[PDB]
C-alpha cells in the first residue's frame, strides 16, 4: 500500500488500484493508477 509519487518498482506493494509504471531506463517503476489501476477493484 503505497501512493502515487513514491514508486513501487514493481506492482507488488501499492495501495490499489495502482500498478507500478515505467518510462525507458527500467529497473524501477512508479505507483500509477493505470493499465489496471481503475478496474482492478480492490
Swiss-Prot record:
Entry comment describing in which tissues the protein is expressed: Expressed by the venom gland.
Main location (coarse class): secreted
SS bond list: 1-15, 8-20, 14-31, 16-42
Keyword terms of this UniProt record: Disulfide bond, Ion channel impairing toxin, Knottin, Neurotoxin, Secreted, Toxin, Voltage-gated sodium channel impairing toxin
PROSITE patterns registered for this protein in UniProt: DELTA_ACTX
SUPFAM superfamilies per UniProt: omega toxin-like
Cell compartment(s), UniProt: Secreted
Entries under InterPro entries matching the protein: Delta-hexatoxin
Source organism, top-level taxon: Eukaryota
GO molecular function, a single term: toxin activity
GO annotation, cellular component aspect: extracellular region
Function text: Inhibits tetrodotoxin-sensitive voltage-gated sodium channels (Nav) by binding to site 3. It slows the inactivation, causes a prolongation of action potential duration resulting in repetitive firing in autonomic and motor nerve fibers. Does not depolarize the resting potential. Does not affect tetrodotoxin-resistant sodium channels. This lethal neurotoxin is active on both insect and mammalian voltage-gated sodium channels.
Family, per entry: Belongs to the neurotoxin 06 (delta-actx) family.
Miscellaneous comment text of the record: In this species, the venom of the male is lethal rather than that of the female.
Name by which UniProt lists this protein: Delta-hexatoxin-Ar1a
Organism: Atrax robustus (Sydney funnel-web spider)
Amino acid at each position: 500500500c503505497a501512493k502515487k509519487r513514491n514508486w513501487c518498482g514493481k506492482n507488488e506493494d501499492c495501495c490499489c488500484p495502482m500498478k507500478c509504471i515505467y518510462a525507458w531506463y527500467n529497473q524501477q517503476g512508479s505507483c500509477q493508477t493505470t493499465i489496471t489501476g481503475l478496474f482492478k477493484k480492490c
